[PDB]
Amino acid sequence: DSCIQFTRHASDVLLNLNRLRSRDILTDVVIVVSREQFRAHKTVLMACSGLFYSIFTDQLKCNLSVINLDPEINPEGFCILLDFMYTSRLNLREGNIMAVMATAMYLQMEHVVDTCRKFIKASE
Amino acid sequence: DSCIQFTRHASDVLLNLNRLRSRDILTDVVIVVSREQFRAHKTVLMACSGLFYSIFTDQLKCNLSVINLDPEINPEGFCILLDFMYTSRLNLREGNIMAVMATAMYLQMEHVVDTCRKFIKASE
Amino acid sequence: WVIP
Amino acid sequence: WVIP
Ligand SMILES: O=C1Cc2cc(Nc3ncnc(Cl)c3Cl)ccc2N1
Ligand SMILES: O=C1Cc2cc(Nc3ncnc(Cl)c3Cl)ccc2N1
Ligand SMILES: [Cl-]
Ligand SMILES: [Cl-]
């Protein structure tokens, strides 16, 4: 086509989606990670995660308002990944890298799994 | 913070949100523009438009499944802007620029209004 | 705005 | 990935 493109549009959209999440506006699901609960938008979770994409395209699970993750999932690792979904920024630290990588593998977030593998390899 | 950032994350999110729109997955509103209907996600519309942001934060309108736009709104101009919301690409042409700018003014999409004003000024 |  |  002969379209023009606004460079900052995708980033501006994601910033506003994070503002709606922070104010709990039109969030339609709560993700339960052991004792912890995280409110989010199903569409953003699907857009970022192979696991959530599979869950919310399922004809029965698409209608659930609560999703319980596997008890081995670390709430902090999930929190870091949820923040990444809504911001593009990943708070990867020596103290959380193992939990973040395991959570990213479970959530099927391949780019995160890739940077975790590389950061771990450099420390070996 | 000491976060790392994935450059293509926002664009990849928007691409997947457009794929969900194309397959009519988790769309939660229909925008009526005279004889034409457009299915979308309320969160994406709010993230792109000052008008939709105001509509869907209203305590009664937030729950509507159908929104009727002003009868002066051109369906093609709306279609072009909805495509822009989900892709960052604007199909701006001599034959549609007036309708696109008027629709962008109504929808409160300031960056679109700005490029339309500039493209019109160059042709004068 | 750019030519993509 | 970059340092933002
Ligand atoms: O590493 C990742 C990130 C990811 C996201 C999704 N999401 C979607 N993919 C294709 N079409 C659609 Cl419609 C969506 Cl929502 C699926 C798999 C994966 N894997
Ligand atoms: O030209 C534009 C594009 C636009 C989007 C929105 N959206 C939001 N703004 C602030 N916080 C939130 Cl939560 C959202 Cl969703 C509001 C005004 C405008 N004007
Ligand atoms: Cl990822
Ligand atoms: Cl805009």
The Cα of C4 is separated from the nearest Cα of chain A by a number of Å equal to 6
Could you tell me which chain A residue has the CA closest to the CA of C4?
A5
Q: Which residues 6+ apart lie within 8 Å of A74 measured at CB?
A: A33, A99, A102, A103
Q: Are B124 and B109 in contact (CB under 8 A)?
A: no
> Which phi-psi region, left, alpha or beta, contains residue B108 (left: φ > 0; alpha: ψ -120 to 50)?
left
**What distance in Å separates the CA atoms of residue B11 and residue A7, rounded to the nearest whole number?**
10
Q: Which of A53, A58, A33 is nearest to A42 (CA)?
A: A53
Calculate the CA dihedral of residues A67, A72, A74, A77 and round it to 10 degrees. -80
Question: Does ligand 1 have an atom closer than 6 angstroms to the CB of A26?
Answer: no
Instruction: Decide: residue B30, CB within 10 A, 0-12 exposed, 13-18 middle, 19+ buried.
Output: middle
Q: How many CB atoms lie within 10 A of CB B65?
A: 9
Alpha helices of B3-74 — where are they, by DSSP H? 9-22, 42-48, 50-57
- Put simply, whether D3 touches A (Cβ < 8 Å) is no
Could you tell me which chain C residue has the CA closest to the CA of B115?
C1
Show which subunits contact D, needing at least 3 CB pairs below 8 angstroms.
A, B
Q: Give me the residue spans of the domains in chain B.
A: 1-124
Alpha helices of A23-62 — where are they, by DSSP H? 42-48, 50-57
Q: Are A49 and A107 in contact (CB under 8 A)?
A: yes
**What distance in Å separates the CA atoms of residue A44 and residue A105, rounded to the nearest whole number?**
18
Q: How far is CA B36 from the centre of its chain?
A: 15
Q: What is the whole-number distance in angstroms between the Cα of residue B38 and the centre of ligand 4?
A: 19
Q: Phi first, then psi: what are they for B69, rounded to 5°? A: -80, 165
Q: What is the whole-number distance in angstroms between the Cα of residue A80 and the centre of ligand 2?
A: 25
Q: Are B73 and B33 in contact (CB under 8 A)?
A: yes
Helix (H, G, I), strand (E, B) or coil at B23: coil
Question: Which stretches does DSSP call E strand in B1-124?
Answer: 4-5, 29-33, 36-40, 66-68, 89-90
Question: Which numbered ligand comes closest to the C-alpha of B47?
Answer: 2
Which fold does the domain B1-124 belong to in CATH? Potassium Channel Kv1.1; Chain A (3.30.710)
Calculate the CA dihedral of residues A38, A43, A44, A50 and round it to 10 degrees. 90
Structure obtained using: X-ray
Q: How far is CA B91 from the centre of its chain?
A: 13
The tokens describing A40, both together, are 């989010």
